[PDB]
RNA sequence: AUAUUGGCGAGAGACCGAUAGCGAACAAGUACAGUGAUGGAAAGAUGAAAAGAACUUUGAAAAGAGAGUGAAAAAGUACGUGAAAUUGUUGAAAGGGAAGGGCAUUUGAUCAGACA
RNA sequence: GUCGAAUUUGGGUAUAGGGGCGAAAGACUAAUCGAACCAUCUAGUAGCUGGUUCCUGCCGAAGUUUCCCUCAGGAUAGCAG
RNA sequence: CGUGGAGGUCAGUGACGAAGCCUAGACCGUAAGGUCGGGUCGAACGGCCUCUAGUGCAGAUCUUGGUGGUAGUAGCAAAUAUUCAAAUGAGAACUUUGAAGACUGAAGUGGGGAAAGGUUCCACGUCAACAGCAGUUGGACGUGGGUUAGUCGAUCCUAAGA
RNA sequence: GUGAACAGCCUCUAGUUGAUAGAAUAAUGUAGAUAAGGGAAGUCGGCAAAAUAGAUCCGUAACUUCGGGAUAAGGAUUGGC
RNA sequence: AAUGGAUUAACGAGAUUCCCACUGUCCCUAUCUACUAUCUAGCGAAACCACAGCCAAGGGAACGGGCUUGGCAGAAUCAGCGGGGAAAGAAGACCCUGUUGAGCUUGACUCUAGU
RNA sequence: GCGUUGGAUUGUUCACCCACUAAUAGGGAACGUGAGCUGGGUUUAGACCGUCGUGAGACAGGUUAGUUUUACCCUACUGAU
């Protein structure tokens, strides 16, 4: 009664795909994502979650802009163009 | 490393017949779950007297 | 192609020995499940029929 | 579900194009250690969770 | 190559193998001891009568 | 002057050598499990070089037998070396409700040294 | 057993852990409830149980004293190297 | 006595075969163990005087992996039930057509959908694994084809509530 | 079609003919039955089974909150043309 | 004696006693069918396991498969069976201990939101 | 050597009648016999009445409701090569 015949009634989703993190944790009745803090401005993270931050900190993505910052510093944030000596 | 071996959320099961008392990795589906942890004899556990 | 079609049959053999029904059957079994081994079931309400 | 959203239909298209075996010319390359497609998915076997 | 412990002249001897054959192991042992050491042309008449329920393979082990 | 388990660039070791070292030497926070928070593995080694076995023959086919490449197929994409539990075959021995062990010698098999 | 209503049921929505909800059984709250599950403090504490990895040589015990919220244990004396 | 690393030394041994492994073959030591021959194998490694430790396993209902006796045994017994010829194929109790026998008996084993699934729908090719027998068949494997709106929905409105 | 009926049994349209099969018919089982004479002596206990059953006509007690009890109990009957 | 008591129609998958009808419950067992079991082709697991399996007597952690003295003892095995193998489901639901807990109660100690 | 019963009241053995019979003798085998049966009674959680307690609850007590489920293994025994 509380087992395999009551598992047949499970066909109503509670969570759906989130826009900020794409994680399928955006709870529908609360309108808030339980993994990435959406729609609040601060991304949810805690210091008891140690593996929880290693899945979502920087460097795990593509880093479309940070991967060129350490290169542009080393030349000195120079402008202009090359010389053809 | 000072945290090597403790990156695990195991828990003891209890006193049944066909199992020991070493805390077992909870969860399911992965094949790591239901294995021993935190022991010096456990595969994937810390060593005795972690060197400093 | 006869070089390439034989290598798809060399590299299939390990899944066939474990009776994997494809390259999409990756059913990983638990070593020991909780509800078979962790319990003391005495006089009273018991954990199954 | 036959009344699906476009957000849902946009992800079935990516799941169809990832549903293929490995190309026969990648078997032949230099220092190929890639042998079989391992993220391959069946509908009967493993649900893809939306 | 790599046969078992054989004691014969390799000039006057042929051979065959089968690997990874999906049979039962306990059946293929007992049907191979029943034929061991026989004349080969008596062996092939013998196996054709096993399929017709005339002569039976004995099970020893 | 002082602080630093993060970031970036370097130099090291009386440290570990694939059940060890980070969870991860590998398309690893990947496969996969859970409604969710989160949980999270396994998996390195053909050869110097694919020269990855043309052709013939038996078979519906996988393969087998020949042949051939290589220093070696006792390295054939189940691939370096390949232990044990367990199993097959050949040869030897024993066996009247267990087996194995200690002292002692017969019978059988097998084996080292030395004669100047 | 009941079967026109204190009936049965879909979807929407409300209440969240010393809290909910209960025509009241300490019932139910995702196979978990006389206090859910997840991660951290955490390798929590045990006067209790189990285990503790090479060989030979020499010497070789105690279950008794007094004190302790002490009686499955300690401190002291004795015996031993 | 033995194991992993360190300093020293023997101008140590080695592709003319180092280490490892197997060995009812030999030798030494009371013993921990040391040494030699034969087999396989292919790239490093030992004696000694000393220095360091993550250093010696039969047991912990030990941890991970591997394999046995049990055993070709229990079993594969709910939902009334199959049969003949031909075609195809190497191979048919199971595939296709025909012949015949039956059932669900329209609160269906029929025809359409909502939730949920995501290509399973259809064709061509094709059977190593899967369908707890089988397989030439398939919701399987390989490559493709396919969903057409001014009127049906969504979009708009407000309910308990956010 | 039978019937008070969307009960049960049978058929037309539509759909399947799938669920490992062959050969034998010991015990003990599982599921379903029938028994001479007696009729609860069985047993903790009439558990289980059997018997009654639809419909029409006749008939219907104590008790009572006058509404019930009541299908009370008990009898006669049922085809075909 | 609203800690509620006496009474009582109707109703009850509530508890107990008897009477008619009825019948394998029984005297007392017999027989028939289907599907298993059984034999075959294909497929093919698990519990459990120190080592294993013939008994009497004696001693003995207080009731031996092994020890000691006797009775005996012939390969390989198939279908039944439920005496034993303290076979197996439960580091026991039972009873004592711990300077181990948790839930609940009250003029126990110490406090606290509130008022 | 052989034989010692059939019934009546409580879970009941304890305790005692009715009739037949030649006679209704006494005992043992883990007060024989639960991996043969029974769960009738023995022991959880539900609930009532009575006593005691300010209370949670315990009882001098009574009534009712209620889950342990192999055998294919070696031996024993009955049969079979």
From Swiss-Prot, chain B:
Q: Domain comment? A: The eukaryote-specific C-terminal extension harbors a nuclear import signal and delivers the ACL4-uL4/RPL4 complex to the pre-ribosome, triggering uL4 release from ACL4 and incorporation into the 60S ribosomal subunit.
Q: What else is known?
A: There are 2 genes for uL4 in yeast.
Name of the molecule in the record:
Large ribosomal subunit protein uL4A
Q: Which gene encodes it?
A: RPL4A
Q: How is it modified after translation?
A: N-terminally acetylated by acetyltransferase NatA.
Q: What does this protein do?
A: Component of the ribosome, a large ribonucleoprotein complex responsible for the synthesis of proteins in the cell. The small ribosomal subunit (SSU) binds messenger RNAs (mRNAs) and translates the encoded message by selecting cognate aminoacyl-transfer RNA (tRNA) molecules. The large subunit (LSU) contains the ribosomal catalytic site termed the peptidyl transferase center (PTC), which catalyzes the formation of peptide bonds, thereby polymerizing the amino acids delivered by tRNAs into a polypeptide chain.
Tell me the lineage of the source organism: Eukaryota, Fungi, Dikarya, Ascomycota, Saccharomycotina
Q: Which family, according to the similarity comment?
A: Belongs to the universal ribosomal protein uL4 family.
Modified positions (Omega-N-methylarginine) are 43
What superkingdom heads the lineage? Eukaryota
UniProtKB/Swiss-Prot annotation, chain C:
Q: Which family does it belong to?
A: Belongs to the TRAFAC class OBG-HflX-like GTPase superfamily. OBG GTPase family. NOG subfamily.
Which residues of the complete protein appear here? 599 to 647 of 647
The UniProt regions of compositional bias labelled Basic and acidic residues, in chain numbering, are 1-28
Question: What role is this protein assigned?
Answer: Involved in the biogenesis of the 60S ribosomal subunit.
Tell me the domain of life: Eukaryota
Encoding gene, per UniProt annotation:
NOG1
Compartments (UniProt record): Nucleus, Nucleolus
Membrane-spanning ranges:
none
Q: What is this protein called?
A: Nucleolar GTP-binding protein 1
Instruction: Share what the entry says about its subunit structure, partners included.
Output: Associated with nucleolar and cytoplasmic pre-60S particles. Directly interacts with RLP24.
Positions of region (Disordered): 1-49
Q: Could you share any additional remarks the record makes about this protein?
A: Present with 28000 molecules/cell in log phase SD medium.
From Swiss-Prot, chain D:
Sequence segments annotated as region (Disordered):
1-21
Q: Does the keyword Ribonucleoprotein apply?
A: yes
- Kindly report the protein's main subcellular placement as a broad class: cytoplasm
Question: What UniProt keywords are attached to this protein's entry?
Answer: Cytoplasm, Ribonucleoprotein, Ribosomal protein
Origin superkingdom: Eukaryota
Give a GO molecular function annotation for the protein. Answer: structural constituent of ribosome
Q: Is Ribosomal protein among this UniProt entry's keywords?
A: yes
Query: Ranges of Basic residues compositional bias?
Result: 6-19
One of the GO biological process terms: cytoplasmic translation
Any Pfam family hit? Ribosomal_L39
**GO CC annotations, alphabetized:** cytoplasm; cytosol; cytosolic large ribosomal subunit
Where, subcellularly, is it found?
Answer: Cytoplasm
State its role: Component of the ribosome, a large ribonucleoprotein complex responsible for the synthesis of proteins in the cell. The small ribosomal subunit (SSU) binds messenger RNAs (mRNAs) and translates the encoded message by selecting cognate aminoacyl-transfer RNA (tRNA) molecules. The large subunit (LSU) contains the ribosomal catalytic site termed the peptidyl transferase center (PTC), which catalyzes the formation of peptide bonds, thereby polymerizing the amino acids delivered by tRNAs into a polypeptide chain.
Q: How does it assemble?
A: Component of the large ribosomal subunit (LSU). Mature yeast ribosomes consist of a small (40S) and a large (60S) subunit. The 40S small subunit contains 1 molecule of ribosomal RNA (18S rRNA) and 33 different proteins (encoded by 57 genes). The large 60S subunit contains 3 rRNA molecules (25S, 5.8S and 5S rRNA) and 46 different proteins (encoded by 81 genes). eL39 interacts with YIH1.
Name the family the entry cites. Answer: Belongs to the eukaryotic ribosomal protein eL39 family.
What is the name listed in the Swiss-Prot or TrEMBL entry for this protein? Large ribosomal subunit protein eL39
UniProtKB/Swiss-Prot annotation, chain E:
Q: Where in the cell is it found?
A: Cytoplasm
The family assignment reads: Belongs to the universal ribosomal protein uL22 family.
Name of the molecule in the record: Large ribosomal subunit protein uL22A
Glycyl lysine isopeptide (Lys-Gly) (interchain with G-Cter in ubiquitin) cross-link, renumbered residues: 45
Q: What does this protein do?
A: Component of the ribosome, a large ribonucleoprotein complex responsible for the synthesis of proteins in the cell. The small ribosomal subunit (SSU) binds messenger RNAs (mRNAs) and translates the encoded message by selecting cognate aminoacyl-transfer RNA (tRNA) molecules. The large subunit (LSU) contains the ribosomal catalytic site termed the peptidyl transferase center (PTC), which catalyzes the formation of peptide bonds, thereby polymerizing the amino acids delivered by tRNAs into a polypeptide chain.
Domain of life assignment = Eukaryota
Report which gene this protein is encoded by: RPL17A
Assembly and interactions? Answer: Component of the large ribosomal subunit (LSU). Mature yeast ribosomes consist of a small (40S) and a large (60S) subunit. The 40S small subunit contains 1 molecule of ribosomal RNA (18S rRNA) and 33 different proteins (encoded by 57 genes). The large 60S subunit contains 3 rRNA molecules (25S, 5.8S and 5S rRNA) and 46 different proteins (encoded by 81 genes). uL22 is associated with the polypeptide exit tunnel.
Q: What else is known?
A: There are 2 genes for uL22 in yeast.
């Amino acid at each position: 009664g509380k087992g395999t015949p009551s598992f047949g009634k499970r066909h109503n989703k509670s969570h759906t795909l989130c826009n900020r993190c794409g994680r399928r944790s955006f709870h529908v009745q609360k309108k808030t994502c339980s993994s990435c803090g959406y729609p609040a401005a601060k991304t949810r993270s805690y210091n008891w979650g140690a593996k929880a931050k290693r899945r979502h900190t920087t460097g795990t993505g593509r880093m479309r802009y940070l991967k060129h910052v350490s290169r542009r510093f080393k030349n000195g944030f120079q402008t202009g163009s090359a010389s053809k000596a | 490393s000072e945290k090597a071996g403790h990156q695990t959320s195991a828990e003891s099961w209890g006193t049944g017949r066909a199992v020991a008392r070493i805390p077992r990795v909870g969860g399911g589906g992965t094949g790591r779950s239901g294995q021993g942890a935190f022991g010096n004899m456990c595969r994937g556990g810390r060593m005795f007297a972690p060197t400093k | 192609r006869s070089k390439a079609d034989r290598m798809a049959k060399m590299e299939r053999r390990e899944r066939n020995r474990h009776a994997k029904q494809g390259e999409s059957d990756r059913h990983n079994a638990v070593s020991l499940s909780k509800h078979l081994f962790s319990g003391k079931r005495g006089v009273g309400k018991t954990d199954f029929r | 579900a036959a009344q699906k959203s476009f957000r849902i239909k946009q992800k079935m298209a990516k799941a169809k194009k990832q549903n293929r075996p490995l190309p026969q010319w990648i078997r032949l390359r230099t220092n190929n250690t890639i042998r079989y497609n391992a993220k391959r998915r069946n509908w009967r076997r493993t649900k893809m969770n939306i | 190559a790599r046969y078992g412990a054989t004691s014969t002249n390799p000039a006057k001897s042929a051979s065959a193998r089968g690997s990874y054959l999906r049979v039962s192991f306990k059946n293929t042992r007992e049907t191979a001891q029943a034929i061991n050491g026989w004349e080969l042309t008596k062996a092939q008449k013998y196996l054709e009568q096993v399929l017709d329920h005339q002569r039976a393979i004995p099970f020893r082990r």
